[PDB]
Amino acid sequence: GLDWWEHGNFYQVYPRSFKDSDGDGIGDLDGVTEKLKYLKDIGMDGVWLSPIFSSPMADFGYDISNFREIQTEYGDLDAFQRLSDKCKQLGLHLILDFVPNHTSDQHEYFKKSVQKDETYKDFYVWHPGVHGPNNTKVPPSNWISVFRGSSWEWNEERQEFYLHQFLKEQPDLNYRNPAVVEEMKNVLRYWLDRGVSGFRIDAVPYLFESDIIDGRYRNEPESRTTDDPENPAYLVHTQTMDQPETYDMIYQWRAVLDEYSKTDNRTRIMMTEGYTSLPKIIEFFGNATANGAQIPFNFEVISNVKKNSTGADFATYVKRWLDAKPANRRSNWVLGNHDNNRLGSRLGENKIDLYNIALQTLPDIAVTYYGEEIGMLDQWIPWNETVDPAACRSDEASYSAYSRDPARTPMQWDSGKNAGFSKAAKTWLPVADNYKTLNVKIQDRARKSHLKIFKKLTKYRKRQILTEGDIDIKVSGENLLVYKRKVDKVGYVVVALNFGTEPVALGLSSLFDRADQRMQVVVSSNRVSTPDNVWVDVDNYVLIGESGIVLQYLWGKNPIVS
Ligand SMILES: *[C@@H]1O[C@H](CO)[C@@H](O)[C@H](O)[C@H]1NC(C)=O
Ligand SMILES: [Ca+2]
Ligand SMILES: [Ca+2]
Ligand SMILES: [Cl-]
Ligand SMILES: [Cl-]
Ligand SMILES: [Cl-]
Ligand SMILES: [Cl-]
Numbered sequence: 001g002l003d004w005w006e007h008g009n010f011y012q013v014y015p016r017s018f019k020d021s022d023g024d025g026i027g028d029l030d031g032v033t034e035k036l037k038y039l040k041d042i043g044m045d046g047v048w049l050s051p052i053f054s055s056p057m058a059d060f061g062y063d064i065s066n067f068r069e070i071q072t073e074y075g076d077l078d079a080f081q082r083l084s085d086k087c088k089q090l091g092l093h094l095i096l097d098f099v100p101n102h103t104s105d106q107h108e109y110f111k112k113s114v115q116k117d118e119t120y121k122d123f124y125v126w127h128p129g130v131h132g133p134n135n136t137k138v139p140p141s142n143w144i145s146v147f148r149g150s151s152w153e154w155n156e157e158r159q160e161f162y163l164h165q166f167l168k169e170q171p172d173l174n175y176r177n178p179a180v181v182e183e184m185k186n187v188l189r190y191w192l193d194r195g196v197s198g199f200r201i202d203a204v205p206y207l208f209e210s211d212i213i214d215g216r217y218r219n220e221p222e223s224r225t226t227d228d229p230e231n232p233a234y235l236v237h238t239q240t241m242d243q244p245e246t247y248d249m250i251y252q253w254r255a256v257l258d259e260y261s262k263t264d265n266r267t268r269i270m271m272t273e274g275y276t277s278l279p280k281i282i283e284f285f286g287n288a289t290a291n292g293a294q295i296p297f298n299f300e301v302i303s304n305v306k307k308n309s310t311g312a313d314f315a316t317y318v319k320r321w322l323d324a325k326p327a328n329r330r331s332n333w334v335l336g337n338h339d340n341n342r343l344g345s346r347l348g349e350n351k352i353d354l355y356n357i358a359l360q361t362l363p364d365i366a367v368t369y370y371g372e373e374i375g376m377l378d379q380w381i382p383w384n385e386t387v388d389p390a391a392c393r394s395d396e397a398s399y400s401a402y403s404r405d406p407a408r409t410p411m412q413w414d415s416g417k418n419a420g421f422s423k424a425a426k427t428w429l430p431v432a433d434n435y436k437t438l439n440v441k442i443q444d445r446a447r448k449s450h451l452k453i454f455k456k457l458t459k460y461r462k463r464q465i466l467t468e469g470d471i472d473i474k475v476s477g478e479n480l481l482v483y484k485r486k487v488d489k490v491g492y493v494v495v496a497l498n499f500g501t502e503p504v505a506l507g508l509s510s511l512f513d514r515a516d517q518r519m520q521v522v523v524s525s526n527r528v529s530t531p532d533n534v535w536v537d538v539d540n541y542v543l544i545g546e547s548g549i550v551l552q553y554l555w556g557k558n559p560i561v562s
Pocket of ligand 3: 101165172173207208209
């Protein structure tokens with residue numbers, strides 16, 4: 001008897017790009033609500049929305065000026081309630097994006113902090129630095145912002161530097177201040193009171209920095225993986241990431257969630273965005289005395305799998321996650337989000353179905369970034385139309401290395417105007433040029449298509465074998481990854497993923513003891529010609545390049561487990 005989330009399908013909506021409902025070219029809450037039934041029909045359980053709160057959009061919602069307010073163009077609190085009520089009818093859990101690390105520099109708390117307001121003077125991390133030789137100002141430490149340059153920003157009015165781990169428009173909250181601690185968990189209660197099933201928590205590794213010692217902040221040592229001192233990777237982040245107090249606060253936040261779970265037998269869940277080392281990701285699950293996040297994102301895989309990764313490479317990172325995961329915790333698999341190039345563009349357009357197969361058939365929790373289920377691809381956007389500050393802080397020659405906008409374009413619903421995302425003359429980001437032939441409606445009608453493969457996976461994974469089965473991973477050569485998932489007296493599933501360009505015979509008898517000369521085809525990559533439901537020889541079947549196949553053998557019935 002699993003809790004709702006343990007084998008859950010989670011879908012990330014980027015609200016600005018999901019569905020426009022009021023003709024301004026901007027996705028909004030009412031637009032999401034129109035589309036929640038679609039999300040249920042493709043097998044989703046939990047819907048996570050990126051920042052919908054009041055924010056000047058310097059970082060497109062991650063710079064929040066009021067954590068208790070819906071941003072105007074997205075809607076109002078009624079629009080939120082209708083979204084929440086619709087989720088409840090459909091049996092979907094709503095997950096909101098919680099951004100504790102920083103506020104907008106337009107937040108009232110920050111404006112008052114700059115003025116040394118007695119209540120807000122210490123809401124942020126301020127330090128004067130030191131005046132140096134030749135009347136120069138030395139910042140309080142050598143720390144580098146994730147968006148490049150110093151993470152200390154001088155404020156003339158206050159005559160101090162404030163800490164910004166992200167943009168200078170995003171001042172870091174001082175979680176050593178108890179007033180800040182209390183205020184931010186009341187933000188969680190505010191939304192828990194309004195019905196949400198949990199939160200995805202932004203930038204968890206960066207919450208606490210180390211404290212002052214003898215009036216100074218400690219510098220960080222050079223990493224020697226780059227010579228560029230404006231690049232955050234220039235330093236080893238011994239002082240600005242992975243601090244022990246960070247984990248303490250995650251656990252405090254989970255306790256607030258647990259207060260609400262006791263109320264009504266509906267587990268509030270926590271997801272955490274942590275681009276950090278695998279052991280420091282794992283620590284977010286919890287420790288001996290305290291639970292943390294049920295879903296600290298498996299960014300071990302996403303950060304290390306590349307376009308030229310082999311099947312062996314993919315297996316290495318999958319196995320590394322599994323070897324490090326504590327037995328009492330659930331895995332999750334994620335290969336896309338709003339900060340990465342779209343999966344097909346990033347990892348190889350031919351592998352869209354291979355990777356959707358992996359994401360959906362590996363154990364426990366599967367994550368989908370909006371559009372991955374139809375195989376959306378990045379859209380190149382001109383410098384003049386790009387809005388992502390990570391691009392605009394670069395230059396016309398080279399903003400495409402940095403820009404996240406190509407992965408944030410409007411969802412492609414149909415072949416009509418703006419791919420059916422909006423009736424407006426212009427959309428906030430351009431619709432991808434491929435939209436007439438890549439959209440939900442066209443894939444819905446096709447015999448085989450990414451969406452039909454996707455839908456087959458999200459349904460099939462909810463049966464007993466893929467819900468309850470173990471996992472046994474084997475690699476043949478450099479590029480044939482195969483894994484078996486078995487439930488005794490029920491059956492077993494074999495996933496075979498061919499990352500290489502050459503076709504290959506599965507040769508399963510030389511990989512598992514397990515016989516059954518023949519297995520039944522459940523689903524396969526778009527280019528595989530083998531019809532569904534036929535039987536194939538597990539030794540001689542040839543899997544074409546860059547393709548995957550899901551194979552089944554039943555001893556008993558394999559029911560949907562609800
Ligand atoms: C794969 O690509 C990366 C980055 O583009 C490169 O550094 C690496 O050498 C490539 N691997 C091979 C085997 O060429
Ligand atoms: Ca709109
Ligand atoms: Ca911080
Ligand atoms: Cl519209
Ligand atoms: Cl857990
Ligand atoms: Cl099925
Ligand atoms: Cl048979």
